[PDB]
Design a protein around this ligand. Structure first.
Ligand SMILES: CC(=O)N[C@@H]1[C@@H](O)[C@H](O[C@@H]2O[C@H](CO)[C@@H](O[C@@H]3O[C@H](CO)[C@@H](O)[C@H](O)[C@H]3NC(C)=O)[C@H](O)[C@H]2NC(C)=O)[C@@H](CO)O[C@H]1O
Ligand SMILES: CC(=O)N[C@@H]1[C@@H](O)[C@H](O[C@@H]2O[C@H](CO)[C@@H](O[C@@H]3O[C@H](CO)[C@@H](O)[C@H](O)[C@H]3NC(C)=O)[C@H](O)[C@H]2NC(C)=O)[C@@H](CO)O[C@H]1O
Ligand SMILES: OC[C@H]1O[C@@H](O)[C@H](O)[C@@H](O)[C@@H]1O
Ligand SMILES: OC[C@H]1O[C@@H](O)[C@H](O)[C@@H](O)[C@@H]1O
Ligand SMILES: [Pt+2]
Ligand SMILES: [Pt+2]
Ligand SMILES: [Pt+2]
Ligand SMILES: [Pt+2]
Ligand SMILES: [Pt+2]
Ligand SMILES: [Pt+2]
Ligand SMILES: [Pt+2]
Ligand SMILES: [Pt+2]
Lengths: 123, 123
């Protein structure tokens, strides 16, 4: 995956959770909007992460572009919103948005992520 | 698995997700609570499902007892809270509690369950 603050092990866990084993699955409807690809990235997220690649959907289905987006989203928001800079923090940002790490709701996502084999207590 | 409203296919899918391939893995602390066994049953859940078997942890590590608990939990709550009585409803109850089927947070769990081999479109 693309380098950055989110660890390779953390990204792999997130990818396995979002797309069912880390696969370029395209877009699925959830909470009234489409989430796409390896990391199930929504359109506003892709806009915020600096619009990497050709476009939202093609980026989402590319392991390098989609992970670059995740890295850049965390660079933008996990820092600004003073999240813990670890997999739990990043996972909660990914699921909850710019201040997801401070929303109790995102703990269910972190719980689920750790059910993925090899992902218990990932940093 | 134990008989009841939750289909055998649904239970297998839930079991595979919860314990990394449906195994009596005992208890783990994710997010500040101990969850145990095949279906990663927490203690209040086991109390609510009618305390089947000898105790919480032994029940949780037993394929019949733990699935009996799931069945009885749904009999208690999925009915009362007017959930859809299908794998989606039951999976979301399991993930989110008595009214989990009406919480958006439990959707990620349902989305992941469906991506387990054999589990696409499970009812
Ligand atoms: C992987 C993924 O798509 N995750 C989803 C989250 O992105 C989403 O949270 C929402 O994210 C957007 C995009 O970052 C947030 O909008 C931004 O908010 C910041 C801070 O207020 C603002 O400065 C930006 O202008 C704005 N960007 C745009 C393009 O509008 C939005 O606030 C987040 N929503 C919430 C409720 O926190 C969540 C929730 O929809 O879902 C994830 O799946
Ligand atoms: C498999 C598993 O352990 N699932 C977890 C859920 O059980 C848990 O949700 C919480 O479940 C408990 C037990 O059913 C809920 O407490 C019950 O609430 C009902 C209705 O309010 C009440 O009648 C019962 O007396 C009460 N039981 C006890 C023993 O207190 C509790 O409210 C649920 N919590 C929430 C937030 O809804 C969720 C929590 O996220 O985790 C699952 O893993
Ligand atoms: O599957 C049957 C269930 O469907 C739901 O849409 C209803 O709200 C429940 O009351 C009903 O028991
Ligand atoms: O509503 C749930 C039910 O759906 C039916 O279509 C299936 O045949 C049952 O196995 C399942 O329990
Ligand atoms: Pt849609
Ligand atoms: Pt749609
Ligand atoms: Pt949004
Ligand atoms: Pt917090
Ligand atoms: Pt929770
Ligand atoms: Pt503990
Ligand atoms: Pt609880
Ligand atoms: Pt509780």
């Amino acid at each position: 995956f693309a380098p950055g603050m989110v660890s390779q092990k953390c990204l792999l866990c997130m990818c396995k959770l979002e797309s069912g084993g880390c696969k370029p699955i395209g877009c699925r409807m959830d909470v009234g909007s489409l989430s796409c690809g390896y990391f199930q990235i929504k359109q506003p997220y892709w806009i915020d992460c600096g619009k990497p690649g050709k476009d939202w959907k093609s980026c989402s289905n590319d392991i390098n572009c989609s992970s670059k987006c995740v890295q850049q989203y965390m660079k933008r928001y996990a820092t600004h919103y003073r999240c813990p800079l670890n997999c739990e923090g990043f996972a909660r940002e990914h699921n909850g948005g710019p201040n997801g790490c401070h929303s109790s709701r995102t703990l269910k996502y972190w719980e689920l992520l750790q059910k993925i084999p090899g992902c218990k207590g990932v940093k």
